[PDB]
Amino acid sequence: YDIQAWKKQCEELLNLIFQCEDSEPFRQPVDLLEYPDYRDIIDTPMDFATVRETLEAGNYESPMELCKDVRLIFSNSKAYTPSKRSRIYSMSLRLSAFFEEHISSVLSDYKSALRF
Predict the structure, then answer these.
(1) Is 22 exposed, middle or buried (CB count within 10 Å of its CB: 0-12, 13-18, 19+)?
(2) By CB neighbour count within 10 A (0-12 exposed, 13-18 middle, 19+ buried), where does 50 fall?
(3) How many domains does the chain fold into?
(4) What is residue 25's DSSP assignment?
């Protein structure tokens, strides 16, 4: 299997995340006009449009780098919206679970493609 293959795999997984309704809050850089204390709580923002731009630009040296970015979207959300009562909390958990389900294989296929 292909050492580059993870690029399309991630392009496609991101396209699936974008298109689903659970990604809505996370598709773009958070608007500070809307959410003005975001930075009091969050040191490093991340959002799926930015992850996709970085991938398209070729600025991920390995899929682990993409993963760190995507997982930051979720840790940010859990830090900024910690309540289980919140619908945003649930959306984030679902989308995270989905992300992690598909990225496993992407990484496992990468690590082992590094041995051929």
Answers:
(1) middle
(2) middle
(3) 1
(4) G
